[PDB]
Design a protein around this ligand. Structure first.
Ligand SMILES: [Fe+3]
Ligand SMILES: [Fe+3]
Ligand SMILES: [Fe+3]
Ligand SMILES: [Fe+3]
Ligand SMILES: [Fe+3]
Ligand SMILES: [Fe+3]
Ligand SMILES: [Fe+3]
Ligand SMILES: [Fe+3]
Ligand SMILES: [Fe+3]
Ligand SMILES: [Fe+3]
Ligand SMILES: [Fe+3]
Ligand SMILES: [Fe+3]
Lengths: 265, 266, 265, 266, 266, 265
């Protein structure tokens, strides 16, 4: 039984860390010459770090401040995409990956709509999560693939296989969303789908933790980072959690808030 | 410039022939035991065949309302069939996704009909609107050929599986670019480039559908498909090609969305 | 040690159920407009159902009546193929799948040659079974593949992999049949072959039972049916049984007569 | 129309050159320790080389009986080799399937010889007869090139693996259509279409074998194959192409089943 | 015949433009926090841009020594970056292998410089020397495009993955033939054939790089690549093509290793 | 702690058996008409068999005699390659496979440089072993693939997969050798590489033993031999051993000197 206080702390912690990550990633991905956007990214790193440090159980007002910041970084991201599409920026992220960051900040914002009214955010239909997080997981596996050294063939084959699986799941979710026009909103093919997707997310989380350990030990050749692998696995964990709650499955044993290495306790 | 009389006639004739086909395909795909649904699909074959041949430049707005009623009814029939498939309550030889694509289509007619009933020329939508509609549709066309071919038609199956893949991949790209629109830039070179690449593929796919229709007409291919299905799929790709040429600013296609080159009596 | 009574009851039950299945499948696969062939299929459903209900241990005469019916449905099937090849029928089965039904009725008929004389049908050379049932298994996996929704990619990949395996085994059986002109009729590469094929049939039976459970629960999107999956698994079971007996292998634990769901006891 | 003198000479010269080649290939593929079998293969090289050059329009029926004796003997030698392979009793660098294909071939000569000994023109068989014989043969040709190429000849290997696949797939289709013949319809459009598709592929494969023979002659390819093997494989595909053109009613091929363009002294 | 003035100018201008590019690429690929290395890469951009534009037919031997000093320094900078990557001590958006290829390249300039400082025309090396250098380089070019393309650029990615594969396969073949040289036969038909096949592929790859550069210039491709990277990769393939034509005895390429067709101001 | 006596006996036994194998393989692979090279191969079979029978712990002088023979068979092999490249010999081995035999005799010779001075041969950098033995393993898997009957599809797919893995590892070793110009000679990506390669060699050894058992029982259709499979597995074992010692890994449980079947005790 979900309540305002715990739900709000959880969401704020989950999302404000993700956005702090985004800001850091963007920052390190900008070419040195991009002074103006580097100043913007640095501002976002400071802003989300401060907000995360401030989160506490006394919250409706905090959520309005969180929202305003979220809308701001959303605009920064879309501004970057806009310049990518016009050949006006050098940044080492592709437009789609930044497009996925935008999908993500918009999920926070949707949650903030409830939180700043003092309402518990509902658990949406399980297809809402699939339509958001499946392209996100595919992009995740895809960045891994693109980020590995030419010589990391086995690791690339593996992440290409995940990319393909998540893309195929996405197409299935698109069609199943169409089936909802029948006004039958839960039916056995949909419940089996969510279950098949959760198993794949379980396998992918395992792969992300391996990649994280490989990055931490410098045993993999790549332009990825342990922090990116940790970030991806926290997001897959949130997605699993929302699936388990929306669909009536076993809860996952993972923490969307914090990974097993990336902390100072 | 597009005018009411010509736009309305063209849209009616395209969509009412398409909906006649759906009804005919559904009718043929039901197991003989499905008496109730067979009654309904036959009523649908008769209804759209009639409306197809009734449409003319006499009382077109009024005609639009009659078309609209019939389109909502076949929509509800399709959705009822899908409901029963998801509950294991009907035997029909189409998979739920194919019939889901038929729903996507009738809903497109219904959107066009909103303007036609008001005596307005429907607009040409942003090219990404058409992509997000017709790319899954084309992938389903290619996948349905692939699943309809005999076990031993391996070279033909390889070829339609490759079309299915390209169209699904084009779809994933359309989905992402649609999100790029959040920048408030609604036209940009990668989008125009995309719509050209898609147009090329549709032209390649139309040649292939034409080949498949001719193999069907000569009994040279082993399958459960039919020449009329291939003709139908080719007319829809033409319509998609046409809307992309108009919305994106490309050369008009040389193909007729209304009538294939074999399925006519003149 | 095989005897007439048990062998005859087993074969009649196995085959008369398969033919009842065929007749039902054909019936539901004909377009409503195919009145004449629907009346024929319905006649075959009634005829094989009655014969199966009648089977009893008092048999030579029964086998002649079974034969006449088998020859009749054989002619109906070939008539359908003939019209497929001439564009004269709408039916939702491809010519090859019906071609395989014909291969199958002809195996019954071969068995009936013995049974109506009161002889125990022999166990044929193991290659006779491979030459019949390997294209049959490939067609089985192939129908599954063709019968799944566009969005069932993982299930399609799996059944495509089985199709390919059975086709490859078929080509091997063709060549090994050529080796028999040496007059060496059993040799170690042939025994290993039959063993490798039995393991693949064991894996495929598992896949067919999963698909059956997915159909029964409506968890898969397809135009297949639980009854078709049950039918396919009973045939693979018969094939395994004939392989074990012809080649000297462990007997399979499966029932060619009746599946775990499709019954009323 | 086909007459005795020309049919007989053509068939003898084709098959006796083919059987000379087999014997030569077997001789070269035996490990030096296999003295007994090397004696036999040498006797076979000498025997078919002689008969190849002996055949002429003088006492052809009588000649047919001498050919036949020698063909049964090399058949039994091939089958003995396969027997020993299956029992691990011989070292020879051909796999059992390749030698099994040589048996399929000598058996084809032997069937033709039944008519030639009686002074009759062998008939042209149903096109499916030729398919069921030569399609596995072609797949084995392509697979033998593929297995004969150096580790590093990856592009050439990809290309022969793709031919192997197509020919195996054509074979699966021939097998099914042969069963369609149970309808008592022995000619139908899908069959005629099949034989045309197969003919195209054989023409593509013959160009490839020609390329491989020229790479062998110039030492430009790393392999254990030989230009004479490629020439041999091309002459057999020509014979198959020829019989399909005659049996199915297609344009005659432009290739010579009797003599390649490099392996002659004139 | 090759003379000092022209060989020296050509080599300087090629390699100093290549090294200018590397420095520029490294500079852009460093995370803003990497102040020390950004200072160094900027010094490198300025240094090779200067030397590029300084080289002329006045005091060329002396100039060679200044080039050489700067080439050793950027070499040591590249190797230091790779060292830090292997120890997890730098954030830079190139993988260690790509920067390893930059080292292979500067080492090639440095070998040429040994002759240029002595006032000698560098020789044209055995064709296998160039293969063993540029084939991994080309595979890395194709793989870097492949990894630089957006998730949704699936058709472009398929195409560069296929180039990557062919170049890696050509490399495995170069490695083996290099061992064949132990026979003391340094030229043989399979080698000449190889170098022709490789030359064809490089021409196919150059067309593709040209396509990619034009997609970059028009913003029609989604990627983190740049038109200047594609231009750079095309100029290097040209240089490789040129050295193969000279070393192996093939027709000279029609492409300019010094300047692309878009990246100039005249 | 490695000493002269044990190291010298081990190396001599390992290598003189490999060379005896090479000579036998070459001998059986020559077309009967190649009289001169058959006499040469037979001479090499006798010469390495005698040397292997003679090996004993009383060694520096023996090593000079071993060397001279090794240089001779090296010249015979290169002479064969030379004739392959000029179309002057019929032999059923491709130039590369013989090229790999040359790589191998040259490793013996490198070891003999030390042994004939009475020095313990060092364990080289682990990359030296990768650069030699990875193309060798790929060629091994490749010969298996090329040596199987057309109908052995599953076995071919498997050995093609190993070929590809070893080739990919080779490309990785090439680049990592380039990284050594940093003067950092051991780093975590290299240690993980050697470990990943050892696992693949463990899987491949298992595959080679299966193929050996299939050859011994005549259950596989091929032109390979049990002795070739044994030979390949002894070489993979030596490579594993050198990797474990050069890189600091667990020692393999396999014998580079002698396989589980091919012996007379
Ligand atoms: Fe994120
Ligand atoms: Fe994400
Ligand atoms: Fe439609
Ligand atoms: Fe459609
Ligand atoms: Fe059946
Ligand atoms: Fe069956
Ligand atoms: Fe032959
Ligand atoms: Fe042949
Ligand atoms: Fe470069
Ligand atoms: Fe480069
Ligand atoms: Fe060896
Ligand atoms: Fe070896």
């Amino acid at each position: 039984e979900r309540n305002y206080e715990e739900s709000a702390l959880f969401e704020h912690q989950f999302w404000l860390k993700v956005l702090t990550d985004h800001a850091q990633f963007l920052l390190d991905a900008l070419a040195p010459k991009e002074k103006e956007d580097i100043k913007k990214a640095t501002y976002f790193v400071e802003t989300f770090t401060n907000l995360l440090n401030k989160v506490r159980n006394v919250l409706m007002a905090f959520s309005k401040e969180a929202e305003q910041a979220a809308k701001e970084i959303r605009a920064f991201k879309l501004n970057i995409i806009q310049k990518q599409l016009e050949g006006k920026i050098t940044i080492h992220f592709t437009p789609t990956f930044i497009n996925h960051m935008v999908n993500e900040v918009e999920e926070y914002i949707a949650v903030l709509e409830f939180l700043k009214k003092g309402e518990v955010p509902p658990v949406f239909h399980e297809l809402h999560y699939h339509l958001v997080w499946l392209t996100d997981a595919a992009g995740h596996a895809g960045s891994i693939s693109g980020g590995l050294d030419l010589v990391e063939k086995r690791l690339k084959e593996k992440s290409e296989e995940f990319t393909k699986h998540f893309e195929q799941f996405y197409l299935k979710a698109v069609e199943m969303t169409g089936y909802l026009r029948t006004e039958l909103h839960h039916f056995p093919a949909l419940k089996k789908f969510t279950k098949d997707v959760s198993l794949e997310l379980k396998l992918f989380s395992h792969f992300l933790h391996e990649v994280e350990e490989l990055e931490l030990s410098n045993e993999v050749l790549s332009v990825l980072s342990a922090r990116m692998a940790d970030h991806m696995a926290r997001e897959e964990c949130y997605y699993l959690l929302k699936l388990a709650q929306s669909s009536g499955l076993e809860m996952p044993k993972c923490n969307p808030l914090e990974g097993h290495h990336h902390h100072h306790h």
